[PDB]
Subunit: 455 residues, 4 copies
Amino acid sequence: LRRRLKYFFMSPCDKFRAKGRKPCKLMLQVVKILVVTVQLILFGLSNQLAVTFREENTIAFRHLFLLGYSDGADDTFAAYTREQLYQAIFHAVDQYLALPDVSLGRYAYVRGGGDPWTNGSGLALCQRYYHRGHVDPANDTFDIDPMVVTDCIQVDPPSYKNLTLKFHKLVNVTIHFRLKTINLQSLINNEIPDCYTFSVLITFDNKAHSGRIPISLETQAHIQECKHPSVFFRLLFDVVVILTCSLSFLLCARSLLRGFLLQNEFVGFMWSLWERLEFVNGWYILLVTSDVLTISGTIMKIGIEAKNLASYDVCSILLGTSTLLVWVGVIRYLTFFHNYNILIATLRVALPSVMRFCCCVAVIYLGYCFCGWIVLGPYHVKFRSLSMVSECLFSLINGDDMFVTFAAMQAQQGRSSLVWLFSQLYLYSFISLFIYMVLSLFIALITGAYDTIKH
Amino acid sequence: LRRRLKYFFMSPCDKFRAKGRKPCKLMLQVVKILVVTVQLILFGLSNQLAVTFREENTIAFRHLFLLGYSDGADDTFAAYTREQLYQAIFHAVDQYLALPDVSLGRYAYVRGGGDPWTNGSGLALCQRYYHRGHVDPANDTFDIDPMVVTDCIQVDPPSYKNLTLKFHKLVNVTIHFRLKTINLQSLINNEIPDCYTFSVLITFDNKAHSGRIPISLETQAHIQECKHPSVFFRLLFDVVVILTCSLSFLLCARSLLRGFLLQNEFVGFMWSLWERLEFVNGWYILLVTSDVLTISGTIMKIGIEAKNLASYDVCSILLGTSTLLVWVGVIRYLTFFHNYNILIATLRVALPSVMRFCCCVAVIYLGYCFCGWIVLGPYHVKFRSLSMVSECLFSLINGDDMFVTFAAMQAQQGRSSLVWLFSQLYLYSFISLFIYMVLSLFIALITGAYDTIKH
Amino acid sequence: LRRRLKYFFMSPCDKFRAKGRKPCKLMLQVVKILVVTVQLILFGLSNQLAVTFREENTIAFRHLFLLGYSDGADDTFAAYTREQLYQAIFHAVDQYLALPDVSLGRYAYVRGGGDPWTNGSGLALCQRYYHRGHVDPANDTFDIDPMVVTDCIQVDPPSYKNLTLKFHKLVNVTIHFRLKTINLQSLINNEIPDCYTFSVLITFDNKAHSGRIPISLETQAHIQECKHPSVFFRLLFDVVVILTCSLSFLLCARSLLRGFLLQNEFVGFMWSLWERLEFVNGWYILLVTSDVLTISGTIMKIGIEAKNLASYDVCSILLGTSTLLVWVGVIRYLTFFHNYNILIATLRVALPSVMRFCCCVAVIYLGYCFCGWIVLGPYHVKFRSLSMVSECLFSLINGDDMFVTFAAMQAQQGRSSLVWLFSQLYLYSFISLFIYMVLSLFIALITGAYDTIKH
Amino acid sequence: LRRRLKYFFMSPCDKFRAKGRKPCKLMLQVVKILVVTVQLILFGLSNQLAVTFREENTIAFRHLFLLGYSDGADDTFAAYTREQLYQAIFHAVDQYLALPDVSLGRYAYVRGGGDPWTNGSGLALCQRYYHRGHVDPANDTFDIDPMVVTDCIQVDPPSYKNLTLKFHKLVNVTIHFRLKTINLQSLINNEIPDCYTFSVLITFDNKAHSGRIPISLETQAHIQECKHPSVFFRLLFDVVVILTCSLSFLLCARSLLRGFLLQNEFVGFMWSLWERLEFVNGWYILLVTSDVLTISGTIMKIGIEAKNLASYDVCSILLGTSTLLVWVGVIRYLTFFHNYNILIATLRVALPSVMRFCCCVAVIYLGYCFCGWIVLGPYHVKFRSLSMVSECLFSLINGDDMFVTFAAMQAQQGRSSLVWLFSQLYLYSFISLFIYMVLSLFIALITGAYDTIKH
Ligand SMILES: CCCCCCCC(=O)OC[C@H](COP(=O)(O)O[C@@H]1[C@H](O)[C@H](OP(=O)(O)O)[C@@H](O)[C@H](OP(=O)(O)O)[C@H]1O)OC(=O)CCCCCCC
Ligand SMILES: CCCCCCCC(=O)OC[C@H](COP(=O)(O)O[C@@H]1[C@H](O)[C@H](OP(=O)(O)O)[C@@H](O)[C@H](OP(=O)(O)O)[C@H]1O)OC(=O)CCCCCCC
Ligand SMILES: CCCCCCCC(=O)OC[C@H](COP(=O)(O)O[C@@H]1[C@H](O)[C@H](OP(=O)(O)O)[C@@H](O)[C@H](OP(=O)(O)O)[C@H]1O)OC(=O)CCCCCCC
Ligand SMILES: CCCCCCCC(=O)OC[C@H](COP(=O)(O)O[C@@H]1[C@H](O)[C@H](OP(=O)(O)O)[C@@H](O)[C@H](OP(=O)(O)O)[C@H]1O)OC(=O)CCCCCCC
Ligand SMILES: CCCCCCCC
Ligand SMILES: CCCCCCCC
Ligand SMILES: CCCCCCCC
Ligand SMILES: CCCCCCCC
Ligand SMILES: CCCCCCCC
């Protein structure tokens, strides 16, 4: 039994020396790295085509329908007078009606299809306002029934000029319409073009009632297969990836079963879950997981190519994660040699103490996150949301973007002095505590763990 | 006595094992974290509403009243010819008079109310100039009585076109007026809208007499309750926070009193203030402070909701600081376990030596701050004020924004060669000394303290 | 023999003390540093002249031929309506025909010379479109023969107004023409001006068929000697550099041969390639390589000055690399003194373990590179290409540009939520793993190697 | 003698305990810190006034005289057609002639005064071109006599419209004129306004002959006292600073002389320059130097206030350096206590080895500097000059601005592939070598020196 247990833990070269076993798993891992990376790149081609089509069409729509729009002005684009708002709305509708004659793209109109469009209508121009809206700031009085009423005009593609906005109680104005187009660029990749429907929403937002009405344009893209198109090997490569991953999965499962049987035999011999897991090859669990991910991604990719699916983002995430895991999994074979296994050995020795340290660090980090989000968020562009606050604080710990973070608050030193002083204390204390004390101890734990396994 | 002293320092689990004592303080701390964080977020809703109203109205005013204004031009917006200045002033007054017909917001005029407005006047257009201003650069002569004289025209809301500026002795021009509006967006938060009065000041500043007159717009917002408004549970949550913090305060005070009595008993037994403080639970002092802060913030928040107060910034600071302290205070219960107490133990061992080191470092840092502020401030945008200089130097020590700091002075290499050379020496010496020597020793002190408590 | 072997490894001062040998190699190295650096600067003069001529002419062309172009708009310059595209094309052609009357430069036309120009034609205006292009998004149909057909109009320098674009199947439009000019600024450097031919290509790109057609201008510069020009010592310096490098090469070769003979004698005496290489002076191999590079660069520079060559970039790379190597090569003489040889000794002790560590780190780095390139590239401006991804990740490891990397993805939190979440996981995991664990161990290896050679 | 030698090295408290000596030097140092800092701030007031006047006038001139100028366009402002250049030149001259009627500042004209102005002339409009300029790119020929000829038109303040530019051989065009103004803002600081003469030079530069002519405006300011001005305590503070610094200088000189006498006595007793310098108080040499600097700066400041001098920059440098040295000099009294003297002790132990390390590092750094400056300078905005290259590399070593440095070269990956590849190798090798190996050893030396003096 001792001989078999010793053999179970021998390196591939040692196993070959002992029993002459050939290292098929290693060759399979190398082949998998190659083929999976190539497959990821080949998929990225079509993924890029789709993403580019969507974004370029959206930019073209912004230039066509938003009056006076220029690149880079999305965050500040707004109207400030009644005349500006009327001109913007009428320009959008007029451009919609003039699209066939002026546009560089070829678009088809969509009619009906439920709310907000009536039958035969292509464009819906709807204004939303309070049901009762008497507002008298001169007398410091108001009488509001805040139930929202929607009044919407229908425009058929080739009376909206009579639009009368209820400015004092206006909640917002929206323009909805759909356009159909064809993604011809797919031909460059030897693929059949798809049929895109863009749902375009233009919003003039007055929910702040502040005298400034921001204007935005958004799109939703729906991809469908076209009807009987005419155009005057990746599938084999996908099948090859499938076969390679299936064989790797089978071999890893066989190894895991053998390890489980050996574990049972050893436990019986001794007549301790931590000692039990010494027979579990975590690398092979990772390999099996990566193989499942790769096969799922390949099936999804084939379905997308066959026009049965259009979930490009899910496929890309699956294939990219599988590629990263496939590259990582080859480190299993450097673990047998000490001089090539410093990183994994240090990880193994250091992880527990690092987690125990993080237990204490996390409460402080979260307290700072919440405090900054709520107190500074209204004044600081980097504290608008909780995820943004976490990104800002994490970057600060790494010494990144410090001065601009300080400078964003310099504008408040005259307006809100107390908030400025609080921001000074907040930023200085956080930076000092986390850079010079928390991170120092984190690195000290890691390097001490390294010192433990050095020899 | 020895048994009681030993019990006083036992961990909550150990105390429960000994006497069966239930850990009510721990559950209270967890509940407090939850409820205080939720309360902070709920307050942040209305705080954001108020801040957004103020800033959005100010931006709308800049777009309405400043001729040719565009976003991002605040720091350079200026006039350069007499015609430009006259056009800007007349545009501001004309827009003020046209506001009801053009603006997207609904504003009411304010009349009278003391200086600078006379009775019945809504807008004050005042120019300030030297009492005697004979200036003759051709003969290199001047005769100045620099007492400032203010001549101000009054405009009633729906003769200012006869304004004649004394350019050669003009100190500045100002336009003052007030507008009333209602913050309707509060309805979205189930709150009654408040009545805002904006005091708008437009400044055309000629104090430099340099041929360039910068133009700025500032606002002051005063919030008041409206008279008999009509609109067709947070209070219980605030009460819950109050009760939780009061109970925590009572328990912490009881523990502190018990510790004080035990301290007195021990001192009597021995028949040393540093040894005396071993009976003071600093965590409980922090908890009591945080409870006082939370109760004060909650009372202020309730008063604001009842329309008795409008100090949003003070309330936000109180509640955010209390939230951070509440999150921090839970570390008291990790202090009993060595593997979870690395940070606090290292802090305790390291703080004195770090303070002694800072004693020496501070004089050098302040010398650099003053030197840079006065010598480079006129030439470097990052050295304009003392707080700005401190932020810049602190960011440099952390390696942030170094190259742009160097590059701002590259424009002086042709104009002011000596100042450029001095800036080179200043920056290089500061960066080298503080990054490679001061900070190295700081981190060395902290990690040596860690090494002392490692085992 | 032992005496001779000991002498072979003595320092220059020790060798002078023993045999009175003069250190000609050291003086040669100092002289080489001086002369090679001076030569590099003198070459940089003319290299700068050439590069500046090319870039300034290209900018002038962009301002002359692109309608409505402004500096900084290269990456967004595009047309969005048919009228805009026609106006841009006609403006380019009209400016080409008006060049002699409006331009600040003096340009000559080029006619004929093969495709795309016919005999006598100076400008080629060609549109490329699908051979069969029936596109019917209304019926979700298309019939495409995607073979590209080029129809191109010829314009002679002083019918193109009848251009009719086939928008629905348009692949792109191009304008090709060549201009001749003379680089007069060379006179300031006491050099004969060269004759430049600029090949200008203007592209209106519709390969995306997205309704947005980007517009770009590119140039290729060909330098030729002019015919019998009239204009009413660097060569000696180049010869001096040649002689210095040749003498250094001869001395280094002599030393290497002597070392080889001593190695053979020692091997014979002992009656081990690693022990063999102890007789190889790597510094002298570096010196010989640098001398070859310097002589090659000097010959290329002389050829360029004589107008036989125009490969400025190759010459600059050769001379700059040789200058860096010449500066580095003087460290050979600090190796004899321990207190001046810390860097090289640590390098020698540390390189093997660092390479073994990199073996493991590289697979993880490459997995991350591929995953990020394919998954985030379509959404993140910093992940567009593989080299860009490597630059971004390498900068992140050094803590640079972290927050903007996070912020570029905040625009996707609303559009593509899943891709945003994946980017969060990707960035956080990469930064943590590589900054706090991989780099820590890298630095630990280097400083441990230093500790080994410290005394 | 041993008692006296022991006393000479006792701390101020120890000296007071022994002989009752009062610590006048310490109180003097504190008083000096206070008064010198206050004096620096008070001077900074007037220094800021002068600098602001100059810069604001220059900006106003750019807006007045440069046609179509806008803020932030200095680096790209240029003409591209003959019509643009003529319009710019005529606009500048017309604005000069219209200044009294349009400008917001009050300016006086200056006439005559030597070249380039003739007697009675206020504006000089001069074009410079080659003496013989036959240029024929069509025939690839030219005949150049490159001697520069200047033809200059004189305009008297209230024929230049007949300007005919020789475009094909034009070297440049310049406009020179002078304006007198008075810095009235000084009144706010209770100072008599000075009389400024601005020498304005507008350059239209065609030295590249590239079809793009950049346009720039520069000013030189000369300050003179005005003649018999009329306007309807800092001097005592300066005198106080003088007295304090003189007394400190006297005491430091007395201490240095006493130390010298004790050194002579000890040397005589022993019957070694390094041992000799143990009697030299370097802190007192620093104090004497700082006192000399402060007195010189104070005298210069008084002279400036009396209108005898106008060298604001020299005075500011003197006073700022003296302030920094005065703040630093107080560390002399923390050297007696070990826990407060870590920084200086580590400096003393570490400086020699650090210098020996820098001996080797400097040659590599300089090689990289020269290589980058000459090879990448024409392509990279951060490598234009040698000082800029040093700043860029120094910032890179500190991990600052890495990604933008990489990204500036991404534009060359298509144009100049070889230069892009070289830049990749250059940047990667420099960053790796200097961040991970050179800086690691630098910090290791410093922390090892700290370890030597730790106990
Ligand atoms: C008897 C049990 C049930 C039936 C099992 C049938 C198994 C079968 O046939 O092969 C297994 C090997 C495994 O190949 P591979 O996985 O590379 O190699 C195995 C591993 O080295 C394993 O150790 P770990 O790597 O540490 O887990 C070791 O214990 C096994 O020997 P051992 O059994 O003496 O302990 C090896 O056979 O793989 C082939 O031989 C090529 C297959 C593909 C050929 C076509 C490729 C296109
Ligand atoms: C006799 C002295 C005067 C009267 C004192 C009356 C006190 C009373 O009634 O309770 C005290 C406990 C304290 O609860 P709590 O603070 O969680 O627990 C105490 C602490 O563990 C303390 O140690 P430190 O934590 O290290 O300071 C320990 O010394 C006390 O036992 P000891 O006295 O034997 O030393 C404990 O009782 O709290 C409740 O029992 C629940 C109260 C809220 C219930 C309703 C919740 C909604
Ligand atoms: C006999 C073998 C064949 C013929 C060899 C003829 C050689 C000849 O003539 O000179 C060699 C020396 C070398 O000068 P240089 O290279 O500076 O000096 C040699 C090196 O120091 C070498 O050690 P490493 O530096 O560690 O390799 C050492 O072993 C040699 O001594 P050794 O000979 O006893 O072994 C030295 O001669 O250089 C001149 O003497 C000036 C030449 C230029 C003068 C004009 C300048 C404008
Ligand atoms: C006999 C030799 C020639 C004549 C010397 C006349 C000197 C005189 O009068 O005072 C010297 C002291 C020095 O004051 P101060 O410099 O603060 O103190 C001296 C230092 O502590 C010195 O040691 P270091 O600091 O290490 O160099 C020490 O050796 C001297 O005593 P010692 O001589 O026994 O060794 C001290 O007198 O300063 C005043 O007493 C106040 C003066 C200003 C009062 C007005 C202030 C507005
Ligand atoms: C040998 C199994 C333990 C290490 C886990 C490997 C997967 C990261
Ligand atoms: C146990 C009291 C000493 C530690 C103080 C805790 C508050 C930060
Ligand atoms: C040193 C023990 C008491 C510390 C109390 C400070 C709490 C903020
Ligand atoms: C003495 C030869 C070994 C060191 C190599 C030097 C070249 C980098
Ligand atoms: C005591 C003299 C040696 C230290 C020099 C102090 C000046 C920096």
